[PDB]
């Protein structure tokens, strides 16, 4: 046992293993220890995959890099491609034209919406929603609940709900439950009434059909989804209005606009109201666990400047907060070797000296799969991982030595803090948060006949409910932003600027013989960075630090825990053999393990 | 009853799963509810850990030699196989166990089919495609990074309807989707035929949709349905949106030179 970051880690209680963690991207193992009362008193995050993209990139052409690193992940598809082209453009001092900037922003914001919404309904919702309980909802009461939760949502009639319910019924009555097989249904960890469950499962199915429409924005600008194409110097989708032979004409842009408007409708009428309502009911049940590091330390690089290449105009303004002090946002510099560093003390890698963290321009990725002496089982059959030694394929990123949480919650806490200091570019997220607090505290309880609470944003946000909430609000905000981006794009084209690529430094003969660059992206899951070194036209070093690398990190040299492990701490389990609470909180980070390890 | 599909994930980026749910005809929703029984799949399944792994032996016993094994991603042979761990054991052990009683095996995507990005030089994990590991079972390869959504569900639909693997070419790909090169029916072909090429990004030629061969388009050596079926309910495809085919469905395309180096012959 030892104490760190205000958490009392104790590994003396009953050990529970969750391998595999399902409803995530990629491969994860989680181990916890629970005390005599089923409270988690220790948590162990193990990334159980590695592919070695950073090794694979060495010696290749920087212009090709985006396509390789895009295949780090098909879920956060395109964010690595964006980071890569930004990194190369940074190294080579290339400025992209305005249309390329706007198209990349639209593509980025499309990913945010698609990623966030699919995660909540298809990965996260079954931690809050009991599908078997939905089988007993009154279709009328469900229609009634729908009208209260989101008055504007057109799909609300009673007949529509018994239609959905009956298809589920005979699906379940078939005896082949498919993805619902061996679920944890009926657990007391579920608190929603039948009506809420049916409403949510209905939206699960609605979202599954709709999500495929949203990505057609990627298809237009980038050819395909998953894995749309990108370009060093701009975008490949050349523009011509007067035309049907160019990649982008006014008809294609009208199509993009129609999809954006559908997105804004879904966020406002389905996604945000569901999360507000589900969040309210679990708040009523007292389930405010899972805050972890969000209560103290949060980080983002900052993103979405309304004036290109001017970081002070970031609409999700970033930086770092420490020790729960929301009055002081520290600036974060991705170039500073004393800020972002990665340790491998407890990771399956080796450094020359593992008592230090390496800034990614000096990063090293050399595999070292070795298990500690206190392991139960063998090298090829682990029964209990030994967290006192190396226990993950994920490196341990820290900022000035501090363990940080990254993600939509971090960005929203940071935006809130910025707004209080006078930053007007963060006004909308602040408005969203205060609207949400008032809905969760007063408005929704009043509509549902529940007692009204008085939680502040400081109390409500650092929680699994808060983390889930911020993801939904970010989706809504991203939809609103790309709606404005579309107008700016069309206006710029109509003013006469059709440029989409800067090719002045496309040829390697124009490059400096040595160069380094960094590209950062506010990816769906948090702070993403790619750091590159170029020598004689080839990649000398390529290092990625990815959002789930931050969140899922194992312990560092000082033994400080990362966001996953901190968030599981101090959480009671209804049944220690059913990982319902573990999944609910882990899933609230939207873990992408392929991303985390690359 | 609906045919059980056990969908395993090795070393992967999860693009084939994502592409699968983009399918319009049929909808993934209808595939899952009305066509197959998706009993194991890490990305969607309710159960985790011990409860998740228990599903495998239950389905294999009950539907022995009558379930489809779908494999996304691939097994590593370096690090004693523990660069991909599932239930404390190498993935290659899970793959071999589930494969022995499958009536058919689908290699989803270029990772499973050929090795994928992780198998590109120097391949630090020794990622190995499924057919080099499973040698005594009929495998259909559905390559592409990812494959087109309708190609994936098209393969499933054929197998469910006829209870047979569709006719395959020499490389184990279904001829119904992989018999044409992109170049055969690419709408920029008339520009290629008249020697009309893009030479620089966003030049006049690019704004007129000229052929992308000189920008490195690998459509002439790449077999897939991209120029006909196209992507995301026929919305576009790489070439239509202005970037050349990078050859993503072909074996070892990562190590066939820069994507922007043109073919010679
Ligand atoms: S763009 Fe590519 S596939 Fe189309 S005609 Fe030119 S070379 Fe052939
Ligand atoms: S890059 Fe791939 S998606 Fe098609 S156009 Fe080429 S085979
Ligand atoms: Cl490949
Ligand atoms: Mg890294």
Residue numbers in the entry:
A (entry chain L): 3 to 244, 248 to 603
B (entry chain S): 5 to 269
Sentences from the paper on this structure:
A prominent member of these so-called Knallgas bacteria is Cupriavidus necator H16 (formerly Ralstonia eutropha H16), which employs four different O2-tolerant [NiFe]-hydrogenases for generating cellular energy from the controlled oxidation of H2 in the presence of O2.5 Among them, only the tripartite membrane-bound [NiFe]-hydrogenase (MBH) is directly linked to the respiratory chain. The MBH large subunit contains the catalytic center composed of a nickel and an iron ion, which are coordinated to the protein by four Cys-derived thiolates. The most distal cluster relative to the active site is a [4Fe–4S] cluster coordinated by three cysteines and a histidine, while the medial cluster is a [3Fe–4S] species with three cysteines as protein anchors. However, in the proximal position, instead of a standard Cys4[4Fe–4S] cluster, the O2-tolerant MBHs possess a [4Fe–3S] cluster coordinated by six cysteine residues.13–16 The unique architecture of the [4Fe–3S] cluster is associated with a redox-dependent structural flexibility that allows two redox-transitions within a physiological potential region, i.e., the cofactor can assume a super-oxidized, an oxidized, and a reduced state. In order to obtain insight into the individual role of the supernumerary cysteines in the coordination and function of the [4Fe–3S] cluster, we purified C. necator MBH derivatives carrying exchanges of cysteine for glycine at the positions 19 and/or 120 in the small subunit HoxK, which are hereafter referred to as MBHC19G, MBHC120G and MBHC19G/C120G.
The electron density distribution was interpreted with 50% of Fe4 residing in a comparable position as in H2-reduced MBHC120G. However, an Fe4–S3 distance of 2.9 Å indicates the absence of a covalent bond. The remaining 50% of Fe4′ in oxidized MBHC120G were shifted by 1.2 Å to form a covalent bond with the backbone nitrogen of Cys20, bringing Fe4′ into hydrogen bonding distance (2.8 Å) with Glu76 of the MBH small subunit. This particular Fe4′ position differs by 0.6 Å from the classical Fe4 position of native MBH in the super-oxidized state, and the distance between Fe4′ and Sγ-Cys19 and Sγ-Cys20 is 2.9 Å and 2.7 Å, respectively. As observed for all single cluster variants of MBH, the Fe3 was found in a double conformation. Approximately 75% resided in the native Fe3 position and formed a covalent bond to S4 (Fe3–S4 distance 2.4 Å), consistent with the S4 occupancy. The remaining 25% of the Fe3 were shifted by 1.1 Å toward a more cubic conformation (Fe3′). However, a covalent binding to Sγ-Cys19 was not established (Fe3′ – Sγ-Cys19 distance 3.2 Å), resulting in a three-fold ligation of Fe3′. The proximal Cys5[4Fe–4S] cluster in oxidized MBHC120G is even more flexible, forming a new cluster scaffold with altered redox properties and electronic structure.
